Amino acid sequence: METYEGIIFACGKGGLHEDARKILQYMTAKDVVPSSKAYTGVIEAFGQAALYEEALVAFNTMHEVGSNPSIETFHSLLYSFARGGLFKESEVILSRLVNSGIPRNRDTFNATIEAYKQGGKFEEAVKTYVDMEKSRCDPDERTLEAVLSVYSCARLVDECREQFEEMKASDILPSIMCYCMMLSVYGKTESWDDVNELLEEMLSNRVSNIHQVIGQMIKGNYDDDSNWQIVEYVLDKLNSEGCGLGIRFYNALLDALWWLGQKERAARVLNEATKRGIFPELFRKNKLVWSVDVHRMSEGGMYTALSVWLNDLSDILPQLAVVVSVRGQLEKSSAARESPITRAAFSFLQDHVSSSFSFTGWNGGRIMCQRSQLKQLNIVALTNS
Amino acid sequence: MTMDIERLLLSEDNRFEFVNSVAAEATEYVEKNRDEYGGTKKAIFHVLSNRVNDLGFDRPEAYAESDPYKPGPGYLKEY
Amino acid sequence: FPLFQLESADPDFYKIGYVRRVRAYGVEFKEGPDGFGIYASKDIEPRRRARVIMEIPHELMITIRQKHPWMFFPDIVPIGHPIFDIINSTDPERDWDLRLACLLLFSFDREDHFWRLYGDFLPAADECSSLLLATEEDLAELQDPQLVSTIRQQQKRVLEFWEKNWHSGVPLKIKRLAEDAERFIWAVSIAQTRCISMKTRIGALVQDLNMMIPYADMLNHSFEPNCFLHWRPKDRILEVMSNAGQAIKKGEEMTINYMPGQKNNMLMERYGFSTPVNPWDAIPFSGDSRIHLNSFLSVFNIFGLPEEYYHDFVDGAVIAAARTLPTWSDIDLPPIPSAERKAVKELQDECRKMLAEYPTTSEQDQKLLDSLSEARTTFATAVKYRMHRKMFIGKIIKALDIYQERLL
Amino acid sequence: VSALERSLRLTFMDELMERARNRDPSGVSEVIYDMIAAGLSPGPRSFHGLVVAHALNGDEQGAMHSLRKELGAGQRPLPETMIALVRLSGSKGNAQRGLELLAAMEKLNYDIRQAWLILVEELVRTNHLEEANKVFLKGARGGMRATDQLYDLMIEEDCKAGDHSNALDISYEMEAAGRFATTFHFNCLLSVQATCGIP
């Protein structure tokens, strides 16, 4: 029990779903009933790879073997759903947590804000933060980062200033993720004065090494063959808290680069993430489907993903080219086609390949291009400002 | 019930297995609902009335009938 | 408050049986243009066991042993009567209908016999649907050379028997039974269309009998019957029993299975009728193209073993389609959808090739039947037969189209 | 359903069923994720191909996992899909799982008689006669009537193994169903009775 749970935790931490599945099969093949904690590690790994179907099967199997889910199990699902913006499934857990006798802790509130944010529900995201303070609790550093992303996403420059300065008002030294979100909201409004003001703060950074290297590489100082090894050195050091922290770091970084005009640099940063296992669902290239999955990405990251995907399309035929913007129960509804990600991807595709990618009549969160229309198709310019 | 018993025995090849089957079905009634039998409703009478109703005919349950002209409690009809 | 809120048969039809211990429970005899029938006079609620619908005493029947020697139960032929010699001269296998016809005509001549009265409710020569009464023009409407030749042999066999045994030198007690060939042909037609064959025990003797049973020969045929026949040896009563646990609504027709496992051409040869929902009808396919038997059965919810197919659009024709279509099966190998579409397309072409063999179509035959005004009973029966076969082939084309699409 | 959706489902189900028949459960999983990427919802016949692919490669755990995926997706498994799992369980001698699946088919309101017949024959074929008798008697005592071929199979195999107690129980149930014993069945019982030392 101790060895099985130890290995599965590592698989769930690093998002190695294939290894986690084999440990579960090995335990069953030896007539061993895995513990409730062991299944939670398997559920964690599937959520790291956006394999929601296999994650909910393991959750279903927990009750079958009598290993009822613990509080940590309902957190593995919430963080898995939060990254994809599946607030419909997040509310199912929340409506289940109140019935299961589990009070809402702080971690539950953070996932709720993150799920609503990624799902485009900006009004409901701040309401959770509004209702969180009424219930007392104690917002942590990620909660401040959770609500800062909401304001940064909906282009609130003055709200983002107040949120960001208060982070350092308590001598917290906000992480590199919050700095990259400041660059996005300043880069979205073309506020080039504030961008240079924040960059000089990240250039000195005598205390934190990651801010210095990442801040330097954004400006383009580290774009040399030998000078890209230092940037890679930081990425390998950050590639030790698992895929959970990595996806948050790359989403903010690509968002900052795209809004600052460093669109060619964002292409190489995304290429650095994929080889490290980040965004394993991003691309599929077989004879049937050529797909790009952007439901767990930021707006800047999605644009970078589409730009590379479109350029690679023109190089080469599959039966279909699809863009997965909504991946959940919201697909079977009209709300998915009104999602901010779905509209942004379609708007991005409209003025890059003319009217070649149209919606689907059978799914709200898909943007397809038939094989016949693929014949009638760089397509996107990737340059640094 | 005498005519009903003869009616049921016309559909039976052997009257001894009919007796055993009725007793077997009556035993099942008592195990299922113990307190409802032994007084006005007898299990064997219930079996016979059920088997007549299974043929599609109508009989009162367990052939139980009561005197409607009894002058209140405590009075026994005298033969 | 209560203040503010198919014709019935002749009343004497049931009465003549009723005064002779015939009992009917919850059913009524109703008469229509197509003939007599038995219908539930009320809602017959389900029970744990089969319900008694009708009871027919043995003494009102005309029965003869299926197997030699020929004994009659009840014994009505006097010793030395010349009718036994006529019965005894028959072929034991093929001439069961001739033996019953001789008994039937003999029974009509007896003053005390019940069938002297019951014979007046039998269909006449122009009302019986038996193909023995069909003219050569009626057989021309069958569009089935095999069935036509079978009927012609039946008519030839029946006629030659009358000519041999009812010649000029026979006694008057024989002449008055069948004064003309048509009278004897009608008797054989009644024998074929109404005979019920059962294994019965009478006293200590168990034997197979060919039986003419009054009031039970009014039950129509169905391949999904709600009733069955049951011989009660102890009091010598034939019971008509509704299926145990099956609810029967008021007005629903009470039916039995005349001929389990038999095709429409067999129903036409024996009873002079056919059904479009016969689950045993077959269609000759080449076998070049085959569909997946397991998929076809599951698409239409047909369960059970092949010899006991049942449905949980789907009717007896789809069940017949499952048994007659060319099928393949490889335990649990799944079918490729694109290869199954080629088979379905090729099977539908062969189905249309056979519909094109008929000069008319199914709906043209249906409107022809509605336009009739002076048509013999057998003529309409012949048209219904070919129309039912067209409806069966058309049902297969529809079933294949549904199956081809539900395989996605 | 539009014409474009039908065209894609045909080519997706063509590829999926060409890998289930190829005994490639991994490939059948890739196509299902291709369907999800295209937005097509995998129906009962798409998960049937996943169950069959695992079942054909003697994989009871993967096939059971595929069934959980189908149930977890809200789809209703086909009667043929359950029969593939029941037959697979019998081939491995897993009578408990075979009986659990039969209970599921009854819950799904299917007809378990044919699947019960298949389960018993697999256990007999795979030399699990002791397990086969347990499954057969439970069905027979439950009211199901077996085939005459399976009745003659169960009686004969039990008597060849010296198991008169099971062979006599089955023959009693065979007549209760309505199939009378013949000289063949009696000769099977006599083959064991003649060696008991009590004439």
Ligand SMILES: Nc1ncnc2c1ncn2[C@@H]1O[C@H](CSCC[C@H](N)C(=O)O)[C@@H](O)[C@H]1O
């Ligand atoms: N299902 C059915 N469809 C059409 N005709 C049927 C039928 N079942 C029985 N018949 C007809 O009924 C005859 C059997 S005797 C049944 C009673 C008959 N209708 C009568 O009035 O005397 C057959 O000759 C056949 O023509």
